[model samples]
Target: PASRYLTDMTLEEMSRDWFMLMPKQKVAGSLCIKMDQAIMDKTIILKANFSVIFDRLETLILLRAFTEEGAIVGEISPLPSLPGHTGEDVKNAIGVLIGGLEWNDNTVRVTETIQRFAWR
Candidate 1:
């Protein structure tokens, strides 16, 4: 459920994770958004990529929304994370957050992924 995946970490915690993880490579994926239940006029998708450097295993997610015309609409980068969260949890949260974003003249919501982590 979205509630369970939702993170409540603070800025300080996120910052600490950023420094500690020191992500160094990119892992990319995408999520689909369905508009108006039946009209397929607009095709919106969330494009995401992250870099992680596993000291103790943490990730930095960068997200952006791309419309059918290939125009970038919304973005959220370096999303917050906590030691207790899993990569799956973060991905779920990204879907939720991106879905709620309001851009140009539309509000996007994630329908599903059109598309991992380890610890010491």
Candidate 2:
């Protein structure tokens, strides 16, 4: 699905949608990485959730591995519109992410990033 969506949609077409950009990496059995990016006007925010487990125990059954993940979405308010007159402006705009995640509905981990830009 991620491949189809990414391969078939253009930036113009994608802009009309609520979100884009997702991880294609697999995180579980037959279940690959999942994510979302909110793009509109000039803002792009990412968010996602998942469950995974890669740990060890002295003695356990199936390791009872189950991890949950989450996302804490944030963006730069100063960033200008993604696509406009310059045509090259899209790449010029600050692009990054700020969010958090969980280890399969069990615990929490976090990360932070920032983006900024301006237009007259």
Candidate 3:
């Protein structure tokens, strides 16, 4: 006499195809700002590069400028109250240099040394 056995291996193999077709959400881009100009003018001109499939409005590309010693200067929205769509390439000027921070006393390389991008 012969007996039949049930195993999970058969079910796992069938579901592999279904999961492979699912969409993956991801965003790839880079942020660029001229440190020399920012320090001299006490303002930041942020440039961003990215792409998306869907169309939308009122998107924010938030950025936080920091010092070499790990201090948060402030948060600036490079793309606020603007129409955002696929293949975005933009540059906006926003000013928020820390108080009592002199542009002449500090070297251009020392101030505005670090930058971070906030995304949701």
Candidate 4:
């Protein structure tokens, strides 16, 4: 099933039809970040590229990575950082990167909530 707040889409659905139909793209492995723990009680925001299992009651933290073949790659601890970021910050980081994929965020990279990002 698809999600309203979250969208599961391929990396080639840019400027195409509804429900995916993006421009052609090449698939490759790259680094990505996602919101992990946004505890209401906690002030700091948590972001990670890997998988995170949070146990608020027991305060347990388990961090793991998912490979291209969906295997565990590594582990990490959530750290606190500054509270200011813009969509451009993310876009620039991606579009200008010499790493994998080189961004490609017209409709494929950010399938959900694209324009609804903060930018200074």
Candidate 5:
């Protein structure tokens, strides 16, 4: 009966363990974006991928957008351990992902902008 409980069940609780009633389905995604800078005379493309399953716990999400990891082989670029605005007012992410991995053509305007940043 809907009004009477037969077992330790719930539609009354806000939420329950996903595994308790049923197993969650898997989800996958991939994304690609292309960019060109006329001023810098450079063209670049980004590809990445991501997947999530009921087996994992972290609820946080990122904007990786499923871009395939760049080249299978290349010199990983360099990045500062920390940004300038750390102590006084601007606490930032542990590291800035600069030109570490790039496409084979290696013409990333994003990396160039970081190099030209005013705070740095």
Candidate 6:
């Protein structure tokens, strides 16, 4: 399922596509910010990466909340991990780094909703 307010496309898709499409220029821009600019300016990459990460975290929290209330569900896996990072730390960082952008009316990713078939 997808959010009707925002979008379904993930940053990974767009940024990866753009990067793959412009390996030289895109990477150059990223390098420019990360290297020549202040550390505070390094959020460009993080901005490109946050949406899907947030979506997953939100879903996990909701699922856990339901499960805690004794709702039947399949076994939940652990949160995704980054190399050299713990889930707790990553989640904390996400909380801190998020909200830099706003999409209150729109969704971060677009997904399909189920349609019912009319039978005569």
- Cα-based RMSD of candidate 5: 19.9
* Runs with alpha carbons beyond 4 Å of true place in candidate 2: 1-68, 75-87, 95-120
Candidate 3 lDDT over residue span 1-120, tens digit each? 332222212333323222212222222233222222233334322222222223321233333333444333333233323333222322222222222223434322222112222121
- Tens digit per residue, CA lDDT, model 6, 1-120: 542222322434333311111111111111111111111212122212121232332221210001122221111122443333333433443332222211122112111210010000
Q: Per-prediction RMSD in angstroms? A: 14.6, 19.1, 20.6, 16.7, 19.9, 17.3
Comparison by lDDT, 2 against 4, better one: 4
Clashes of 4: 2
Candidate 2 per-residue lDDT, tens place, 1-120, comes to 121111122334323322224321212211122223331223222311111122111111010011222122222111223322221221122121212112112232221211111111
What is candidate 1's TM-score against the reference? 0.36
What TM-score against the true fold does each predicted structure earn?
0.36, 0.16, 0.26, 0.23, 0.17, 0.22
Which candidate number would show the highest lDDT if scored against the true structure?
Answer: 1
Location of the lowest summed lDDT over 10 successive residues in candidate 4: 51-60
Ranking according to lDDT, highest score first: 1, 3, 4, 6, 2, 5
Clashes of 2: 6
After superposition, the stretches of candidate 6 with alpha carbons farther than 4 Å from their true spots are: 1-15, 18-83, 102-120
Cα lDDT of model 1 by residue, 31-62, tens digit: 22222322224556555444444421244344
Clashing pairs in 2: 67-103, 67-104, 68-103, 68-104, 68-105, 70-102
Give the range where candidate 2 is weakest over 10 consecutive residues by summed lDDT: 56-65
Residue 61: error of model 5 in Å?
Answer: 14
Each candidate structure's count of clashing pairs: 1, 6, 0, 2, 8, 9
TM-score of 2: 0.16
